[PDB]
From a paper:
Catalysis by protein tyrosine phosphatases (PTPs) relies on the motion of a flexible protein loop (the WPD-loop) that carries a residue acting as a general acid/base catalyst during the PTP-catalyzed reaction. The classical PTPs hydrolyze only phosphotyrosine (pTyr) residues of polypeptide substrates, while the dual-specific subfamily members (DSPs) also dephosphorylate phosphoserine (pSer) and phosphothreonine (pThr) residues. All PTPs share the conserved signature motif HCX5R(S/T) forming the P-loop, which includes the nucleophilic cysteine and a conserved arginine, which, along with backbone amides, binds substrate and provides transition-state stabilization. In addition to the P-loop, PTPs share an aspartic acid that protonates the leaving group in the first chemical step and then, as a carboxylate, activates the nucleophilic water molecule in the second step. Closure of the WPD-loop moves the conserved Asp residue about 9 Å into the position needed for catalysis.
Structures were obtained of the PTP1B T177G and YopH G352T ligand-free enzymes and in complex with vanadate. In both ligand-free structures, the WPD-loops are observed in the closed position. The G352T substitution in YopH introduces a new 3.3 Å hydrogen bond between the side chain of T352 and the backbone carbonyl of M328 in both the ligand-free and vanadate-bound structures, stabilizing the loop-closed conformation. We were unable to obtain a crystal structure of a loop-open conformation of the mutant, and interactions of T352 in that conformation are unknown. The difference between them is nearly identical to the previous report, and this smaller difference in YopH relative to PTP1B gives rise to its narrower pH profile. Its G352T variant shows a much broader pH-rate profile than WT, with a kinetic pKa of the nucleophilic Cys residue lower by about a full unit.
Author numbering: 187 to 468
Write the structure that this text describes.
Amino acid sequence: SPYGPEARAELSSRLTTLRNTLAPATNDPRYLQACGGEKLNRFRDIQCRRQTAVRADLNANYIQVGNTRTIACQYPLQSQLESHFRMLAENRTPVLAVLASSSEIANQRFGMPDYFRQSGTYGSITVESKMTQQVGLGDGIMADMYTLTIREAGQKTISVPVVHVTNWPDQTAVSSEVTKALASLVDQTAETKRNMYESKGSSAVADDSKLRPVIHCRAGVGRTAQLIGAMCMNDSRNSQLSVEDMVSQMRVQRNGIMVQKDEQLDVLIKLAEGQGRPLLNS
């Protein structure tokens, strides 16, 4: 009954209205606008909430779901790579979770630069990629780890752990068991990195805007939202936060598409049910 179909229909009713309301109008004040001709949004109809935007020229948002602070973004465009690495370094990013598959990245019709599996140079920024370990998450889903070393003349060199899930297909939900395992791996990767900064006295430890996990897929609204929802539910401080509130918060802080497919919401509903976490408010 709390997770029964009538309660599920009510959750969908509420979240669908929210989706329709957040649809970007033309020159929408709620959404970041492109400057002078540069393409900003990888998908025209998938925009970046202005109040929470990380950088003027990225489709990327600060996300806070209850107490859990991340960054969700689209796969950076080729023209956005220099700005994307600056965001990564400035955030002292404890983990970068890439959920776009190897097949999507390889498909050049998609304009998805291979920016974390290859060493490269992007304006003043030089990036060195090194593949570390590989990890299975269940159901055949595979993760490849890298560390990206981001150098720039006169800037502090930052190294970012990368978790790349290689075969989560677009517009699907991986299983709740896989989702729980991926959230654990991303959280643990981030904790290890944060601990390193802490052990060296890093002042970025006390700054809420920093040390956030950075997560993207292709648009940064389907698979990305499912992972953030799970990471949210893996933060004990988020006791009693309902599914309605978690998705609403993602949607008001990014766009109305966060949690894109019904199947992805179903995995959030299933994790919540396993916790005894409410679906609805009141």
